[PDB]
Amino acid sequence: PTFLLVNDDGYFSPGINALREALKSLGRVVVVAPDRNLSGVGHSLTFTEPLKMRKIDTDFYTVIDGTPADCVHLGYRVILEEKKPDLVLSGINEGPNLGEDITYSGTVSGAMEGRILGIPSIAFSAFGRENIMFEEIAKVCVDIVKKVLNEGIPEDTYLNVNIPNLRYEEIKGIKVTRQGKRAYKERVFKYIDPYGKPFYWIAAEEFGWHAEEGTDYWAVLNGYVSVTPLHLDLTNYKVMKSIKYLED
Amino acid sequence: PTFLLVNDDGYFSPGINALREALKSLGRVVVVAPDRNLSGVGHSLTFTEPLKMRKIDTDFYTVIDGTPADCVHLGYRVILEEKKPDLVLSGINEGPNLGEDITYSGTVSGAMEGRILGIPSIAFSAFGRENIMFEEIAKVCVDIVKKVLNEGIPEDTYLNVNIPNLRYEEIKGIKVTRQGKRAYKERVFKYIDPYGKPFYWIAAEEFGWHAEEGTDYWAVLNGYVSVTPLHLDLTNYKVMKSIKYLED
Amino acid sequence: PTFLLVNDDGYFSPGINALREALKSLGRVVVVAPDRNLSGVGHSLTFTEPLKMRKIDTDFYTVIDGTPADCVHLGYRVILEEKKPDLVLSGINEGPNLGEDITYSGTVSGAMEGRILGIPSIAFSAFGRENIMFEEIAKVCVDIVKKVLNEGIPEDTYLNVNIPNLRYEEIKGIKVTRQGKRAYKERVFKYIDPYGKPFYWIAAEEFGWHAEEGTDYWAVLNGYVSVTPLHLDLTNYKVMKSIKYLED
Amino acid sequence: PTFLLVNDDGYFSPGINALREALKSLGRVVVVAPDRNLSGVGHSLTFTEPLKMRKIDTDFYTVIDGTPADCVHLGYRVILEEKKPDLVLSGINEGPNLGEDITYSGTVSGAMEGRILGIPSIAFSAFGRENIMFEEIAKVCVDIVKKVLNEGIPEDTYLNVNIPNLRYEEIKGIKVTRQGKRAYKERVFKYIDPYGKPFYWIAAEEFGWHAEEGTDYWAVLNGYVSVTPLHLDLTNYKVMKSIKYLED
Ligand code: NA
Ligand code: NA
Ligand code: NA
Ligand code: NA
């Protein structure tokens, strides 16, 4: 098998490297990843500027200022010569991608792009902040990839996986989950600047205090891997009949 | 009624101002919008830095380097004092937000954030490049808002609206649509830089040549307004049973 | 005569357009300017990515994400076919470039680049914040250019000009000035974020209260145009003998 | 003695850490450095937004998205409580800062800011691209600091130091140098994009082929440390008389 592996943190990040090393036992890992951390910025496909892509080593390429989307598309069309890999994999992200924040994630968008191209795809993110054990986390990622190669991913779906920052042997198990609503309370704090004008800080309070069993958040907060099947197609087909009044 | 109106192009853009002006006949428009165009960059909610918010005029505020998400959240919690408006509206965007590219749109994410907060929400984008007639487009936006205030938006949904760049009287009608694929063929062009190293340009070819009836792209290409009901919850519930093998 | 006119605020800014229109009576104005405001970001010459340059109208070009430096160099080598114009002009900037802040200015760096290429060069900046009268300011810019074409700029020098935001007839005169030291008092304000960690705001207090006659700041604060001759060569030749101990 | 040490590459960079470690034998090193690499972006002092500053360890702080200028000013006013250190040091930069390009350098601007504040200051940059031996380079930096603490830096000056990427014992010596031009030939290459529109690549050719003895470039190209004394005051006083015609 062959995997196209991308990320959002950069080709040098411990998370993509840990995953690449672990995956070698299942097949050929072809890395195409940004040359910098793009977590904070745009993730769309670049149509209107060109992109440098440089070979770091055999099957290991970087796209200079390339988004995960750019990496997936250049990986597939240029590096793999339009031969679909078995999987597109994105991660392991340096931090979680849970709940409503999935929409803004570059790691998730890499997997989405693979699925747009007709390739089964998985995003992997670490649920931790400090001293993340990426080599431990990679072990469960590889367990998942092995099973997916055997059994496959259902229609109109790609997988969003979050792994607790635990040693492999301490992971409680793997749970299929739904996307949660934000597992925190939002509070805005007001300040006055040196010139007398207001400014604000949006604070996240009480993280996970009210996590609902069945959600991605609850799984990882409790020591389980979360695997959420995401729709590729965002259309709410069921409810179209209820907005046909707009056509009148 | 009261509307919280945001955008991604900046408070000064002709699209947000056209929509603001037109909406006055339906209720009170409270604008909270970025001070710059953020189309090309990140759109997430800002938790890690504070945000300046400046009053431009009555019910008209800008958030300095604030994403649409920031604007919705500060608009709701600070400006509206946690009193939900009737609608959160985002746009009119300077350019379309169709198909697969909806995931990357700041305009769409503003409407998403409204719906996350429990408020019915609509994104409006102009399907044009040059000489966009924002005041003509605003007329059909207000027609839609009027109907939505009367009839409402169904479960688990927010609306994504694209309007052709036509005079109001030339719009053929309004269609309820699904999210299309990408209505173009992707081709990568290879170049060699001055130092002998490769670079690539991802080109979009044959735009709309194969547009499928029923999609957002087809509607706007043919002179109709497109209204797509989008899921807020990305979870593919139907297929969970088919990935429970991952729990074994 | 022919002028190569650049700026840092973008080809559409009122300041570059006011200057371009006024200069037509002295010669041919060839504009090459960024497609966006680059005041807040890097200004260096781009060596390692390519640059799109698009014709807006005859003798009026934009460099997409091009710094003033890129604009000067592409203007000279591509648009002017390596035929030196009589002057490189940069501005009129939307805000001042005085004192120690000159080092960080994109408007000033455009003029510097012209001088690096062996062309006499002038930067123009407006000393105002709100409701800047760019067409009034352009009148004095043109007065200066006319005189410079007649008499010339001395060796190893380019000019840094700041113009008060006054009607042309209210300008008191033009003064040759030195670069001032920052005409304000710096104070740092401390705050505590929602999570209990410190943050700081560097404030500028008492602007111009202690301005020294002879400086750029004093001239503009008192209603005069400031013209400062700047060194191109930063080397302090006089003092080399006093650091030769480092060679021992 | 006490040194305030900043850089532009980030607090984690091998260059700043190598220099920090080496300097401990001469006095107390207080580091205040950005949390990310800011080489490609703006370097000005931040007046319009607040700045988070986090303690990493004793006498080791980072300013979140803080320019070198921000770091020097917060280091002096907050960390050092307005007690001037013996020196402000900036570097060791990951790459050179030679010739005309000094104007655009964040590393150089950190040293400039120290001298603006009335503190003797030195910028250090590595003349290398790959496999830079920062610990070897730090040895000659400390040699220079030791001498400067003994003998001092002359009027209106701060030092700009570039060190070849050589083992300490292979460095040929230290030379006092002037700012060179640009030691390369500029050539613009033209391309056509996938849509038929032009784009350009500014190339640097023949690097160092014509380096002039006495310049910063020549010294480092030939295995010597370059130390250039730079003016803080950019004013060309000598030539003021030759532009007084502008006052007429
Ligand atoms: Na990331
Ligand atoms: Na936009
Ligand atoms: Na500017
Ligand atoms: Na640097």
Curated annotation (Swiss-Prot), chains A, B, C, D:
Gene: surE
Record organism: Aquifex aeolicus (strain VF5)
PANTHER family found in the cross-reference section: 5'-NUCLEOTIDASE SURE, 5'_3'-NUCLEOTIDASE SURE
Keywords recorded for this protein, A-Z: Cytoplasm, Hydrolase, Metal-binding, Nucleotide-binding
GO cellular component: cytoplasm
Listed name of the protein: 5'-nucleotidase SurE
GO MF term list: 3'-nucleotidase activity; 5'-nucleotidase activity; exopolyphosphatase activity; metal ion binding; nucleotide binding
Coiled coil start-end: none
Pfam family, one: SurE
Location(s), subcellular: Cytoplasm
Record field: catalytic activity: a ribonucleoside 5'-phosphate + H2O = a ribonucleoside + phosphate
Sequence similarity: Belongs to the SurE nucleotidase family.
Lineage: Bacteria, Pseudomonadati, Aquificota, Aquificia, Aquificales
